[PDB]
Amino acid sequence: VAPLDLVQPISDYKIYVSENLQTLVRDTREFTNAVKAGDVAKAKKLFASTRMSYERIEPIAELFSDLDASIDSRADDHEKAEKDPAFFGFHRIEYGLFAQNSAKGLAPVADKLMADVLELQKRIRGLTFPPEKVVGGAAVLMEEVAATKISGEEDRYSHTDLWDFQANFEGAKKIVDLFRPLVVKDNRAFADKVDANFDTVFKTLAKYRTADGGFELYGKLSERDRKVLAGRVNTLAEDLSKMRGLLGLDL
Amino acid sequence: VAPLDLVQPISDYKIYVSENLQTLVRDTREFTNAVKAGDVAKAKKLFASTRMSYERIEPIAELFSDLDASIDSRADDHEKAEKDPAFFGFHRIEYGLFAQNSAKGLAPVADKLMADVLELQKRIRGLTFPPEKVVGGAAVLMEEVAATKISGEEDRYSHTDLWDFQANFEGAKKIVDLFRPLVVKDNRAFADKVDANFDTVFKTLAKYRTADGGFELYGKLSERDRKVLAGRVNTLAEDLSKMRGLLGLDL
């Protein structure tokens, strides 16, 4: 595996991240002004959809730790939970729109979210992507889904976790797809296994679609379902970690 | 497994974390004093040993994400690498001590490191430990070791990564030990599997001990050894992730 063969998947990945960041800015803009307009109903329907682009690019969340916490921290990440006035980002807006059914005082929160998402796009715009951060970061994200998100920690008020899970998996599959030509050269069997493992997980999530094609609220997933999902997602984390090694990225 | 059965193990875990925090505070004071005194050689000798207590309590790192960044961020997490003004903590000092062999300009960095460590101890004292954070966070730490730390990213200048790894594994093992009385009731086979898997990892690291009982610098680990280590460590993440579900923590 020549390191030069890595440049082109990475350049392709940055384009993928860039376009998703474009969607996020656009969507966050439509999301915030809706919150600032006081329309709770419209903003609630835009919550998961806006966050989709963010959840897709989280395999490189390590490269913007500061922003990730400002944008996507949960209440349990703060000493005084929801009440904490230093609690900003999506899940603070989420608490307002979904738990208390009101947009009260979310104006500075929405503007902060906008600025952060803009700073995020800018930061990543001038960021070069180490392939080990991309592949390795994808592995960690999968483990985070299975081991830290599996009870619905991410969306405790909207319970739209399945949308986020789907986006996380999509974001990780993109990385797998891009690096496949390199992997399949000396590890075709493993490459096919990784694809099959993602197919298994996507199909698992597909069970929880609704009649109109949406997702069920995460509370509908039983304990047995969650434990099964976590195990299959762990396989994805395992795959991506081994993939890093096979790409020669351990040096 | 009833949620009440989790109360005492968590209480014993916080004691464990608190004790390591006490050690960390004492060690950091000795370490930072050497740095401010301009004793490069002495500070270098205390680098890994001071960081031991910190690396032990990293399974709950998400419960102090801001401080974790201030204390332990690496150069490649910032846009302008080593010279980035936002680059503080252990690895900012590590660069001066090991790469530049100088304590020049490290005194204010040493002051901040002390303040942050002290703030870390304070934050954790008034913090409640959710058992899902402890077990799930341990699983993530393991994946982080296997998928992100595996090429020696953590200690790029001192290459004392094996010391950190050993500490990470002990920290995760403590969590395993604490919940074993609960797991082994209806999952004895699994409990012994986890113990065996950790034994495999510890024994792997034992290979890289030196004559006087120290550790090899991380550059000594071949690519092959790193890939094998990652695989075995991934098993630990899957164990811990599965353990979370077995403890009833997916609800």
3-state SS record for B149-162: CCCCCCCCCCCCHH
Residue B161 Cα, gap to closest chain A Cα (Å): 14
A16: Cβ–Cβ under 8 A, 6 or more apart, which residues? Answer: A174, A178
- From the CB of residue A14, how many other CB atoms can be counted at a distance below 10 Å? 18
- Going by C-alpha positions, the residue among A48, A1, A59 that lies closest to residue A24 is A48
Cβ contact (<8 Å) for B151 and A69? no
- Is any Cβ of chain B less than 8 angstroms from the Cβ of A188? no
β-bridge mates for residue B90, sequence order: none
Spatial distance between the Cα atoms of A115 and A109, rounded to a whole number of angstroms: 10
Asked whether the beta carbons of A88 and A112 are under 8 A apart, the reply is yes
Strand partners, B215: B209
CB of A170 closer than 8 Å to CB of A201: no
Kind and range of the H or E element at A25?
helix A7-36
Q: Please state, in angstroms and rounded to a whole number, the distance separating the CA atoms of residues A106 and A93.
A: 6
Q: What is the DSSP string of A3-16?
A: GGGGHHHHHHHHHH
DSSP state of A250: T
Q: By three-state DSSP, how is residue A211 classified? A: coil
The CA–CA distances, whole Å, from A22 to A16, A36, A105, A124, A165 equal 10, 21, 27, 12, 21
Contact criterion met (CB < 8 Å) for B73 and A62: no
CB nearest A151 (choices: B66, B132, B234): B132
The residues with which B188 forms a beta bridge, in sequence order, are none
**Does the annotation list B119 as a binding residue?**
no
Phi-psi region of B102 (alpha: psi -120 to 50; beta: other; left: phi over 0): beta
- Looking at residue A188, which CATH number applies to its domain? 1.20.1420.20
Count of domains for chain A: 1
User: Is residue A250 a contact partner of residue B227, using CB atoms and an 8 Å limit?
Assistant: yes
Residues 6+ apart with CB under 8 A from B206: none
In Å, how far is A202's CA from the nearest CA of chain B? 19
Q: Which domain holds residue A211?
A: 1-251
A78 contact B CB<8A? no
Q: Which residues in chain B have Cβ-Cβ distances shorter than 8 Å to A139?
A: 143, 146-148
* A161-186 and A223-246 helices, crossing angle to 10°: 30
| B211 CB burial (10 A radius; 0-12, 13-18, 19+) | exposed
DSSP A213: S
Closest CA to A241 of B172, B207, B75, B229: B229
3-class secondary-structure state, position A127 = coil
Q: Residue A250: which of A168, A136, A163 has the closest Cα?
A: A136
What is the spatial distance between Cα B55 and Cα B47, in angstroms, rounded to a whole number?
Answer: 12
Q: What is the CA radius of gyration of chain B?
A: 18
A223/B250 CB distance under 8 A:
yes
Residue B2 CB-density burial (10 A; 0-12 exposed, 13-18 middle, 19+ buried):
exposed
The tokens for A174 are 């993109």
Beta bridge mates, A14 = none
Q: What is the 3-state secondary structure (H, E, C) of chain B?
A: CCHHHHHHHHHHHHHHHHHHHHHHHHHHHHHHHHHHHCCHHHHHHCHHHHHHHHHHCHHHHHHHHHHHHHHHCCHHHCCCHHHCCCCCCHHHHHHHHHHCCCCCCCHHHHHHHHHHHHHHHHHHHCCCCCHHHHHHHHHHHHHHHHHCCCCCCCCCCCCCHHHHHHHHHHHHHHHHHHHHHHHCCCCHHHHHHHHHHHHHHHHHHHCCECCCCCECCHHHCCHHHHHHHHHHHHHHHHHHHHHHHHCCCCC
Give CA–CA dist A78/A131, Å, rounded: 32
Report resolution (Å) to 1 decimal: 2.0
Contact B129, B14 (CB under 8 A): yes
Report how far residue A104's alpha carbon sits from residue B165's, in angstroms, rounded to the nearest whole number.
47
A51: closest CA among A146, A155, A203, A148? A155
In whole angstroms, give the CA distance from residue A234 to residue B236: 11
Angle between helices B223-246 and A131-147 (to 10 degrees): 20
Q: Is B156 on the interface with A (CB under 8 A)?
A: no
Is B131 at the interface with chain A, CB within 8 A? no
Token pair, residue B66, equals 């801001």
Measured CA to CA, the distance from residue B191 to residue B227 in angstroms comes to 26
CA angle A69, A73, A75 (to 5 degrees): 140
Question: Residue A108 burial (CB < 10 Å; 0-12/13-18/19+)?
Answer: exposed
In sequence order, what are the residues at sequence separation of 6 or more whose Cβ sits closer than 8 angstroms to the Cβ of residue A158?
A: A44, A47, A48, A94, A97, A98
Q: Is B65 at the interface with chain A, CB within 8 A?
A: yes
Count how many Cα atoms sit within 13 Å of the Cα of residue B211 in the half-sphere of its side chain. Answer: 0
Residue B27 labeled ligand binder: no
Count the neighbouring beta carbons within 10 Å of the beta carbon of residue A171. Answer: 24
Helix (H, G, I), strand (E, B) or coil at A85: coil
Beta bridge partners of B209: B215
The residues, ordered by sequence, that sit 6+ positions from A236 with a Cβ below 8 Å of its Cβ are A142, A169, A172, A197, A198, A201
Q: Indicate the length of chain A as a whole number.
A: 251
One-letter amino acid at A58 equals: E
Q: What are phi and psi of B126, to 5 degrees?
A: -95, 20
CA distances from A214 to A53, A207, A208, A217 (A): 17, 11, 9, 10
Map residue A182 onto helix, strand or coil.
helix
Do the beta carbons of residue B62 and residue A48 sit within 8 Å?
Answer: no
Q: Decide: B136 and B239 in contact? Cβ < 8 Å.
A: no
| All residues at 6 or more sequence positions from A62 whose CB lies less than 8 Å from its CB, including other chains | A133, A137, A140, B77, B148
Q: Which amino acid makes up residue B93?
A: I
Technique of determination:
X-ray
Q: CA triplet B32, B38, B44: central angle to 5 degrees?
A: 60
Token representation of residue B49: 């040993």
Nearest-angstrom CA–CA distance, A195 and A184: 11
